[PDB]
Amino acid sequence: XXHXXXX
Amino acid sequence: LPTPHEIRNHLDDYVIGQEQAKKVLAVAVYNHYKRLRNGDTSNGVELGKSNILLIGPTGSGKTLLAETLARLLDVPFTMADATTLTEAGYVGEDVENIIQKLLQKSDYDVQKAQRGIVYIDQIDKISRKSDNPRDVSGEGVQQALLKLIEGTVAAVPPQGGRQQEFLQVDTSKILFICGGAFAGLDKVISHRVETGSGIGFGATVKAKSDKASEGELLAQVEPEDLIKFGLIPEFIGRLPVVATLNELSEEALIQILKEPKNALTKQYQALFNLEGVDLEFRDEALDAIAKKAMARKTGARGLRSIVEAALLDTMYDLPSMEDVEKVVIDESVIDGQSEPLLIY
Amino acid sequence: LPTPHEIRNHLDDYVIGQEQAKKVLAVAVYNHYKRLRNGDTSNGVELGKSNILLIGPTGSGKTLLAETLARLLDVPFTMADATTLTDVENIIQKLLQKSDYDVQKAQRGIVYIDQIDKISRKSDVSGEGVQQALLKLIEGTVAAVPPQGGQEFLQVDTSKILFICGGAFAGLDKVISHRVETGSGIGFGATVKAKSDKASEGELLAQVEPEDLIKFGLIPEFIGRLPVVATLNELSEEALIQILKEPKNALTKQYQALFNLEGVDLEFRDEALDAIAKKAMARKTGARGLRSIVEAALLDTMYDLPSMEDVEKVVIDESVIDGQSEPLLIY
Numbered sequence: 001x002x003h004x005x006x007x
Numbered sequence: 008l009p010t011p012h013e014i015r016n017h018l019d020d021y022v023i024g025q026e027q028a029k030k031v032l033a034v035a036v037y038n039h040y041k042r043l044r045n046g047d048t049s050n051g052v053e054l055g056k057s058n059i060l061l062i063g064p065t066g067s068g069k070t071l072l073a074e075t076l077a078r079l080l081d082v083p084f085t086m087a088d089a090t091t092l093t094e095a096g097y098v099g100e101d102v103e104n105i106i107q108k109l110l111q112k113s114d115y116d117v118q119k120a121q122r123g124i125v126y127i128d129q130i131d132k133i134s135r136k137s138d139n140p141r142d143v144s145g146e147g148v149q150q151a152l153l154k155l156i157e158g159t160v161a162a163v164p165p166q167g168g169r170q171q172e173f174l175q176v177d178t179s180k181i182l183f184i185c186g187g188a189f190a191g192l193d194k195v196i197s198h199r200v201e202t203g204s205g206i207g208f209g210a211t212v213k214a215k216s217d218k219a220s221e222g223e224l225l226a227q228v229e230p231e232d233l234i235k236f237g238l239i240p241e242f243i244g245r246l247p248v249v250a251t252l253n254e255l256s257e258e259a260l261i262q263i264l265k266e267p268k269n270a271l272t273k274q275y276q277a278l279f280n281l282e283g284v285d286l287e288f289r290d291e292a293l294d295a296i297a298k299k300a301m302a303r304k305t306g307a308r309g310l311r312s313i314v315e316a317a318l319l320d321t322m323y324d325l326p327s328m329e330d331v332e333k334v335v336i337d338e339s340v341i342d343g344q345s346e347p348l349l350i351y
Numbered sequence: 352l353p354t355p356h357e358i359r360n361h362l363d364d365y366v367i368g369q370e371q372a373k374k375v376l377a378v379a380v381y382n383h384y385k386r387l388r389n390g391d392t393s394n395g396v397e398l399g400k401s402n403i404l405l406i407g408p409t410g411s412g413k414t415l416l417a418e419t420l421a422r423l424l425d426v427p428f429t430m431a432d433a434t435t436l437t438d439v440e441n442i443i444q445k446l447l448q449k450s451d452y453d454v455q456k457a458q459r460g461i462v463y464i465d466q467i468d469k470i471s472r473k474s475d476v477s478g479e480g481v482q483q484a485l486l487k488l489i490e491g492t493v494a495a496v497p498p499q500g501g502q503e504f505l506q507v508d509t510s511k512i513l514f515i516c517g518g519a520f521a522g523l524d525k526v527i528s529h530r531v532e533t534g535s536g537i538g539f540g541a542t543v544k545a546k547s548d549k550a551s552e553g554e555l556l557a558q559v560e561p562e563d564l565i566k567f568g569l570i571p572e573f574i575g576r577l578p579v580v581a582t583l584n585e586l587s588e589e590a591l592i593q594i595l596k597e598p599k600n601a602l603t604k605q606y607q608a609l610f611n612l613e614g615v616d617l618e619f620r621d622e623a624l625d626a627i628a629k630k631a632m633a634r635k636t637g638a639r640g641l642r643s644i645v646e647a648a649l650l651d652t653m654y655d656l657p658s659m660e661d662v663e664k665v666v667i668d669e670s671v672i673d674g675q676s677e678p679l680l681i682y
């Protein structure tokens with residue numbers, strides 16, 4: 001569905 | 008048919024404070040149509056494409072120029088938005104839809120649609136920011152738009168079909184006006200060129216002075232600066248013409264409140280006239296308003312805040328009050344230290 | 352079909368001031384394309400895959416060489432960048448966007464890269480990320496690419512695809528100077544860098560070895576895949592004047608054509624052209640930014656030229672470039 005990207 | 012002298016005067020009637028920008032648009036508009044009059048028939052081969060790139064602060068009149076130009080110009084005009092644009096059309100929109108709306112304005116006239124104008128607001132929205140990625144509003148949108156801006160024939164069902172056929176409407180002839188507010192661009196130009204921070208006695212330091220940061224900095228913009236912003240270099244290469252708009256001057260603000268037919272004083276006094284009391288504004292109040300507006304750094308759109316907040320108390324109790332023939336507003340009312348004095 | 356002598360003439364028609372660069376591309380392109388024809392019929396199978404590396408100052412026409420060559424040979428070419436990378440798939444699909452359908456036609460295309468020095472290994476995730484990632488890309492592989500975006504994936508070989516890594520290596524001249532020419536610049540007897548603009552640094556770059564690039568920041572494994580090296584020379588002041596007139600298509604020609612359609616003749620004096628060169632030098636944008644000066648200088652004239660009547664010819668004085676005067680109009 002959506003997008004997730006982090007660190 | 009196009010006239011650069013008259014067109015500048017026509018825009019002056021509806022727009023004030025941007026004289027240099029009017030000259031740039033008249034040249035590109037005249038050159039673009041002149042090219043189509045004799046298409047690729049001159050001796051000069053590989054003629055550069057004539058496009059427009061509007062760049063200015065908020066409330067500078069970017070959306071206004073597109074509206075005024077549409078009214079003056081005879082060919083159909085369109086006003087699209089980049090936020091709605093999405094790649095591979097999942098649920099939002101498709102790039103081809105922009106051509107469909109153009110035909111509705113042109114009434115499915117391919118000969119009349121190819122000579123149309125296109126204006127996309129919020130160009131910065133499509134800036135590629137894919138540091139942490141799929142991306143539907145980033146590279147995908149710019150990639151599709153660049154393909155269209157390059158000049159290609161795209162299938163468009165005329166009228167939607169009652170057929171399995173589509174028309175191959177050209178795109179190189181159609182003009183495009185990419186414009187929007189660039190936030191953070193000034194810092195990028197300032198980062199590249201500072202020429203300061205001298206600690207020596209001979210060296211000079213400018214902490215408040217920023218060499219007309221609002222207008223001069225824009226004038227010295229380069230394509231390489233936009234690359235760091237997120238745009239694709241090929242997209243900027245296709246637009247040799249860039250328009251720079253300086254911040255509105257206090258003198259310009261006063262003119263905007265008097266000359267236009269959409270002036271705040273004219274509509275507000277008209278509203279008061281419906282109630283039955285006339286509204287009077289002195290010249291001293293006008294220049295005072297300009298100083299406050301420039302401090303906010305919100306453009307003309309934020310001008311209303313000062314005028315409305317100042318009249319909040321007056322309008323609240325004006326209906327209850329009676330026997331007031333006219334209303335007089337002094338310069339102090341803008342500051343708010345002294346309440347306005349009514350006339351009976 | 353073409354030859355190194357014929358391509359050189361064609362290259363000279365649109366490019367000037369770079370003679371050594373022409374011979375490098377002619378043999379590399381001719382040989383590379385020759386591999387596509389012979390294929391594996393010859394005894395020497397598994398031939399080809401020779402990369403091209405370009406190092407020169409900004410505004411030297413490095414990008415123009417690829418675009419002009421693509422037009423001369425009518426071969427699809429794309430202009431991708433490595434500064435954006437922190438994807439690799441974007442580079443492969445990019446080329447396909449030219450026609451959106453290529454099985455045995457995109458393999459023979461060409462690609463150009465700009466700002467190759469940015470990826471230099473600082474000593475640092477910003478650098479060295481890309482070089483290790485580009486190794487497999489240069490060595491050849493196949494990547495999935497949805498044709499047109501859509502439900503069947505497409506495989507395209509990358510070994511045949513040629514790569515041209517363009518970029519500028521600032522400060523590299525000093526690095527080799529201490530190693531090969533002489534250790535100087537700070538001492539009394541030691542020669543200072545007095546000839547910043549009096550002499551051209553280019554001659555020193557001609558002796559650039561792969562070992563010198565390691566000190567700049569590059570990885571030796573990355574440079575080994577690009578054995579070919581090109582050393583563009585420093586753009587000359589006269590070259591700018593030549594660019595306005597000598598090439599097949601120049602800004603002056605284009606402007607002359609536009610006014611020619613209007614019916615007014617356009618003439619640029621030699622004195623005016625040299626002044627433009629000096630202004631461009633301060634910008635440090637070379638030819639890429641030269642167009643901007645002409646646009647602003649002639650914006651006022653262009654605005655009033657259609658309104659003006661019975662103007663047979665336009666004379667542009669050198670003062671116009673300075674900005675203290677207007678060009679003379681001949682009736």
Ligand SMILES: Nc1ncnc2c1ncn2[C@@H]1O[C@H](COP(=O)(O)OP(=O)(O)OP(O)(O)=S)[C@@H](O)[C@H]1O
Nearest residue numbers: 022023064065066067068069070071188263307308
């Ligand atoms: N240059 C201007 N001259 C006069 N009034 C202006 C000007 N710019 C904005 N205004 C006023 O502000 C209103 C809205 O202006 P807009 O053009 O919508 O502002 P804008 O910042 O250009 O919009 P964006 O940023 O492109 S979405 C107009 O109806 C005018 O009343």
Ligand SMILES: Nc1ncnc2c1ncn2[C@@H]1O[C@H](COP(=O)(O)OP(=O)(O)O)[C@@H](O)[C@H]1O
Nearest residue numbers: 365366367409410411412413414415594638639
């Ligand atoms: N010899 C030349 N003749 C004509 N144009 C040139 C020449 N050299 C450079 N240019 C101009 O420079 C531009 C390309 O600059 P480029 O080489 O990409 O700079 P950089 O290498 O810094 O990216 C082109 O628009 C081209 O017109």
